């Protein structure tokens, strides 16, 4: 259906037609011996066929790194960033979340993950100059009900938080109508949702941000310590699908994760009391891994809770940390607190 335009000899295309090969993806799916036995023809013509199919699929532009560096507008994924709404957090993240790959947020309960997720959901609708993407967001609740009251309070207090942006266009922004909420209850339900509903929303352009309220919640209620292989298969499939969608539509994916204690009797966590859940198979699918921690009254006997946001690993970010507080306006980082 598509290999017809390729230059070739009639014998090989007749063999392809007799062998029921549809597109270049199908022929690249099979290997050397498989194609040789299917077409029943010599090796050099198979090599020529593979070369021609590869040249058809790709291999046109010689893209150097100067084209990546200088041409800012040609490759937004390498330069454009999604701001977190607070200058201190953006400085810690050197601009914000990347537009490609998966970003993980992990921590214990009552740490402030949902507040950051809501702030990122609101912050995506700003124009590109103000650190937004001029699009909506998708929220997938996997554990419990969505906090509508807190979202309404944040929307009401939004003019107070965005002090730098002048407020003439703030009233034009319709925050409520550009946020989509979904609910799931099983691992299979979440897989079906990400397979079917999410691409429809991203392709048509309603939203350019995907948030999962708790990826670890469905997986902790089905698989025990003796069923690691099916869980690994499901995690690999979900990660592959999410990465493919994010790369295709240039939409950041933010995943919220839970933690489990060390239970001291590796992966880089030597003296840490808690570690991200879902094992190492899930950790291989991510790009930037964060961690939000709260020191309890033992260290928080000073009057107010102590919250620190830490960077665990990233291809372009040193391991750092800062501090932040949660108020009626949102999440704000404490100035002059970044650690080196």
């Amino acid at each position: 259906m598509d290999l017809d335009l390729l230059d070739l000899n009639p014998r090989i295309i007749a063999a392809i037609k007799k062998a029921k090969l549809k597109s270049v993806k199908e022929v690249l799916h099979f290997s050397g011996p498989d194609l040789k036995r299917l077409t029943n023809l010599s090796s050099p013509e198979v090599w020529h066929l593979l070369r021609t199919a590869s040249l058809h699929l790709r291999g046109s532009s010689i893209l150097t790194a100067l084209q990546l560096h200088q041409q800012k507008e040609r490759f937004p994924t390498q330069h454009q960033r999604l701001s977190l709404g607070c200058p201190v957090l953006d400085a810690l993240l050197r601009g914000g979340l990347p537009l490609d790959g998966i970003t993980e947020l992990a921590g214990r309960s009552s740490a402030g993950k949902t507040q950051l997720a809501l702030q990122l959901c609101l912050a995506v609708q700003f124009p590109r100059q103000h650190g937004g993407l001029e699009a909506g967001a998708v929220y997938i609740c996997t554990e419990d009900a969505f906090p509508h009251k807190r979202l309404q309070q944040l929307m009401a207090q939004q003019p107070r938080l965005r002090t730098d942006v002048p407020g003439e266009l703030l009233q034009k922004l319709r925050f409520g109508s550009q946020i989509f909420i979904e609910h799931v209850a099983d691992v299979d339900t979440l897989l079906e949702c990400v397979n079917k509903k999410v691409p429809v929303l991203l392709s048509r352009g309603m939203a350019r941000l995907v948030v999962i309220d708790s990826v670890a919640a469905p997986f902790r209620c089905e698989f025990d310590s003796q069923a690691s292989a099916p869980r690994a298969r499901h995690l690999q499939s979900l990660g592959a699908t999410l990465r493919e969608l994010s790369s295709a539509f240039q939409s950041p994916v933010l995943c919220i994760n839970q933690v489990t204690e060390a239970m001291e009797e590796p992966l880089g966590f030597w003296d840490e009391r808690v570690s991200p859940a879902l094992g190492i198979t899930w950790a291989n699918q991510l790009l930037v891994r964060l961690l939000a921690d709260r020191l309890r009254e033992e260290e928080a006997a000073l009057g107010c809770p102590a919250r620190t946001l830490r960077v665990l690993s990233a291809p372009h970010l040193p391991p750092s940390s800062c501090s932040y507080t949660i108020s009626a306006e949102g999440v704000r980082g404490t100035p002059g607190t970044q650690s080196h």
């Binding site: 270049v24 993806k25 690249l28 799916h29 290997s31 050397g32 011996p33 498989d34 029943n40 023809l41 010599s42 090796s43 050099p44 013509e45 593979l50 070369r51 199919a53 590869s54 040249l55 699929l57 790709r58 291999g59 010689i62 893209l63 150097t64 790194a65 100067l66 084209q67 990546l68 560096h69 390498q78 490609d100 790959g101 690999q236 499939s237 990660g239 592959a240 990465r243 493919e244 790369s247 590796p266 992966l267 880089g268 030597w270 094992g279 190492i280 198979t281 950790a283 291989n284 991510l286 790009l287 891994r289 665990l312 690993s313 291809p315 372009h316 040193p318």
Partner: protein, 324 residues
Amino acid sequence: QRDLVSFPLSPAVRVKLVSAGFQTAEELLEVKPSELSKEVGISKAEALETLQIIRREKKCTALELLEQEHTQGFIITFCSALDDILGGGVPLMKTTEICGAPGVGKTQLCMQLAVDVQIPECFGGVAGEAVFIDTEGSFMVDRVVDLATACIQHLQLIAEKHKGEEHRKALEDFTLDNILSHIYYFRCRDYTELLAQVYLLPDFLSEHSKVRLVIVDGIAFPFRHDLDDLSLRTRLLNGLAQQMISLANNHRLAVILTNQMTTKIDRNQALLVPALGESWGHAATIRLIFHWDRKQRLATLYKSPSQKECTVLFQIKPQGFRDT
């Protein structure tokens, strides 16, 4: 006596030829194609292509190989102890594979090797190019810029300390824009795209003969998802390894591959082992593993045909891959 099975003949022409009763090319060499076509019921085109493919299908000893490998240098790593343990750096004409836990520094090492391959021969480099194939999207230009700036600062420092005119002559060409234009970028989001790019590599290397390094940052990700059939994966991996080693030996390159670690619950205490099964274990000439120990990164050589395995410490600074 040469059996026809040992030739790249099409199965149809081979089967009809052996049905006729010919079992040696020495007598196919002189048979006129007219009666050849008449006897076995074929046409002129297949006869001539069989004749040419049969007729178409050097003497280097150990001394020549030793001299040749002494002529070409090694790729610096900017880690002195790692260079010492590896015999002087990453060797050419061989496939090198690196494993390690996520967030350990494999991508940093790949970026440093991409930068380090452009060091002029006067300072002790190889002065070549680099090809970077990304399968995960973890290629950030800012980190490469920072690494190149650190490298050029160190190079200027050592050149000034040497106080030699020839060193200065090889620095004005060594500018940030020039070196950063010698890294060719690709991106394969699927294993089929990666395979197609691999098939297309030899022509690209023929066009650009100055390339001395090929990097494939991540081969486990394309093959570890959405592949239920293990035999197909094994065949694809074996073919890819054979093609990569063939490219390395044909074009005098240094293939760099990146792998992933997987937990194995042995006895009762789980330990990390490289992924992609056990058959893949000896598909790479050299195997390197990066540990974590206790807040200390260790680079332990695992398999090599030249040096015994040992252990070396290292760490990552805002300037790149460094020792100490």
